[PDB]
Design a protein around this nucleic acid. Structure first.
Lengths: 117, 51, 151
RNA sequence: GCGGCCCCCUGGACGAAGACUGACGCUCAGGUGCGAAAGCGUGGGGAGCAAACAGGAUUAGAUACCCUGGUAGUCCACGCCGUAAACGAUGUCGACUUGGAGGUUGUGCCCUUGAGGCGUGGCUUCCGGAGCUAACGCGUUAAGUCGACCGCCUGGGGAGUACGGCCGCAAGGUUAAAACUCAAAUGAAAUGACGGGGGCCCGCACAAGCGGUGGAGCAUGUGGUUUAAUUCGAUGCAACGCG
């Protein structure tokens, strides 16, 4: 219902996990998934396998609105950012550009410092 | 701090970034200011080679 | 194993065919230094494969070698604790030798009464990629297609 | 000790050549002043933070860090507190004595005309002579050659401990002993196994295959047994067809 065929994709990257989400231009999301939902419990979540499999799982879940192009909203410096883009460029979507929107806070608050290592 | 590379590597190979980490400056700035310590780059490695 | 060199060594062929390929087949089919019986079973297998195939014996041999031919493999290094292997195109001489030894082991996987009969039947049904070693080739191929994720 | 940007009050330093007063200086025992962060008192404020505590894993053994939460306190306005590795481990003020490549600051007459010639100054870097230095090293900003002062030292523990007098609201801070005990406590120096903390080459040891047997049947000798004893010894790559 109400096929869009255009939108932007938000990508999250973290040391402990990674998730992929998809929305439209104005910003009402349509897809949601966790790489841990595809299994791989433990440190293997950081491996590209879970990220990529969650990528095609979300892509299959979102075919129903019929999209053809998307945009890369990547977040976080975590390992990855490579499985998702090159799994979605051939999943039935064509990329448009790339961005860097990972925050760089201007020395606002004290970071968690109790951590030795 | 950023990665935008391709499929093949997927594991480690960022030990060059470990060398470029410069653990001194990060371990110095994460915990308090010193104003006399980051000098370790000079004046104590070349100037203290005592035999 | 680190300073030595490779001289491309070559040993006694069979004078009837006079081919280095058939030379290496017969010389690896050797066991414990056995010449008469080993070559006798080799010729028995060759004549039987020609009889069953019906086509020319040498071209059927080449077709069988092409059927058993694998493409790629990797080497275990144990670098990071997980499977971290760079897929290297194996040496053509080493690839040929590995194909030879896979054929020989496929022949060896039985325990039949008569060595000549067993050898003839298995190589003959392996000549058309439907025998014994082609399963090993497929398994080796399955070992590939997934080691390129890490390079 | 000082870091967004705007405005107002305000402190020192230095340069250019000009006039001007005419030893008006230096150093400072008691004494006033300033003095990071933790603390205490009045209130105000509370985003994240995290002493004490709350729960899980943790091993020979955690009231240790690792993780999840979580008050004082870090913030503001007034007052108290006078200590630190408050170290350049080098008290202040003057006059002299061989050298080098810089950072930076304003004027000289040119020749910015290019980023070159006067440092004629100030503050700072890093190497390195004569000379000192027990040695490491200091080395025109001296640990050199001299002068004026001050403050401080006489072996380590007992100890910046105890009484006593001051300072404070408390926690406490300054001034400073003895009895007894020891043959020492201590600096610099590569002088070596130590390279378990880092670099570099070497070996069927590793990157491949064939056999063996801890899988069955038989001798072997000890550490050894069932008997009359079951000789001297073979108990780490130095136990086996060995003496």
């Amino acid at each position: 219902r109400k096929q869009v065929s255009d939108g932007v994709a938000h990508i999250h990257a973290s040391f402990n996990n990674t998730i992929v989400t998809i929305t439209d231009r104005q910003g009402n999301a349509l897809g949601w998934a966790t790489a841990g939902g595809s299994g791989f419990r433990g440190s293997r979540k950081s491996t590209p396998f879970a990220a990529q499999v969650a990528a095609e799982r979300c892509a299959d879940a979102v075919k129903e609105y019929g999209i053809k192009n998307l945009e890369v909203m990547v977040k976080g410096p975590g390992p990855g950012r490579e499985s998702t883009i090159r799994a979605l460029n051939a999943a039935g979507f064509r990329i448009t550009n790339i961005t860097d929107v990972t925050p760089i806070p201007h020395n606002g608050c004290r970071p968690p410092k109790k951590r030795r290592v | 701090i950023k990665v935008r590379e391709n499929e093949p590597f997927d594991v480690a190979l960022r030990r060059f970034k470990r060398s470029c980490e410069k653990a001194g400056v990060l371990a110095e700035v994460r915990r308090r200011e010193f104003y006399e310590k980051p000098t370790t780059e000079r004046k104590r490695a070349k100037a203290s080679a005592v035999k | 194993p680190r300073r030595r060199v490779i001289g491309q060594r070559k040993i006694l062929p069979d004078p009837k065919f006079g081919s280095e390929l058939l030379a290496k087949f017969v010389n690896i089919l050797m066991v414990d230094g056995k010449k008469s019986t080993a070559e006798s079973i080799v010729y028995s297998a060759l004549e039987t494969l020609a009889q069953r195939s019906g086509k020319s014996e040498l071209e059927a041999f080449e077709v069988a070698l092409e059927n058993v031919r694998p493409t790629v493999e990797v080497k275990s290094r144990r670098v990071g604790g997980s499977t971290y292997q760079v897929p290297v195109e194996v040496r053509p001489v080493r690839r040929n030798a590995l194909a030879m030894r896979w054929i020989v082991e496929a022949a060896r996987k039985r325990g039949d009464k008569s060595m000549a009969l067993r050898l003839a039947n298995e190589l003959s049904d392996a000549a058309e990629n439907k025998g014994t070693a082609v399963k090993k080739r497929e398994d080796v191929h399955r070992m590939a297609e997934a080691n390129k994720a890490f390079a």
